[PDB]
Amino acid sequence: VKFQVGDLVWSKVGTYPWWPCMVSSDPQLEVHTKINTRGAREYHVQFFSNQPERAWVHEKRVREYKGHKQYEELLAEQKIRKPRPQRERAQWDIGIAHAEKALKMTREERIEQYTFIYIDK
Numbered sequence: 737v738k739f740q741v742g743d744l745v746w747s748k749v750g751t752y753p754w755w756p757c758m759v760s761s762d763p764q765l766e767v768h769t770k771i772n773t774r775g776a777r778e779y780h781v782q783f784f785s786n787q788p789e790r791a792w793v794h795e796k797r798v799r800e801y802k803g804h805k806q807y808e809e810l811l812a813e814q815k816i817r818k819p820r821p822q823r824e825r826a827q828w829d830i831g832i833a834h835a836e837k838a839l840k841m842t843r844e845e846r847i848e849q850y851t852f853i854y855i856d857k
């Protein structure tokens with residue numbers, strides 16, 4: 737267990753680029769980490785965005801968030817680069833702005849400021 741609740745991380749999920757996140761406790765499982773059905777470790781994260789979402793992410797797709805400029809280093813992991821779609825870039829920029837504000841906070845302040853409120857349907 738390398739991450740705890742309130743830690744800032746980058747997550748690489750689905751078709752999306754490396755995205756700013758905060759580790760949090762799953763609202764139903766009440767754990768922030770688990771061993772999945774394939775026997776691998778996963779972390780529960782909140783994506784920083786104007787569209788709040790959460791996901792369980794494989795530990796190999798999670799990295800410590802040290803700052804927004806670290807994005808280049810994650811891409812490093814003729815030069816070939818994927819283009820950046822406008823709508824997705826705008827959502828990522830909002831997320832980064834939140835992550836940069838969260839980085840100036842203590843872990844306790846971040847937990848209080850950003851932990852999602854979940855409402856049953």
Ligand SMILES: Cc1noc(C)c1-c1ncn(C)c1-c1ccncc1
Pocket residue numbers: 749750752753755783784785786787788789790791827
């Ligand atoms: C979208 C969406 N809906 O559920 C999940 C999970 C996602 C998702 N998967 C990976 N990223 C980066 C996201 C995401 C979440 C919020 N805003 C922008 C993107």
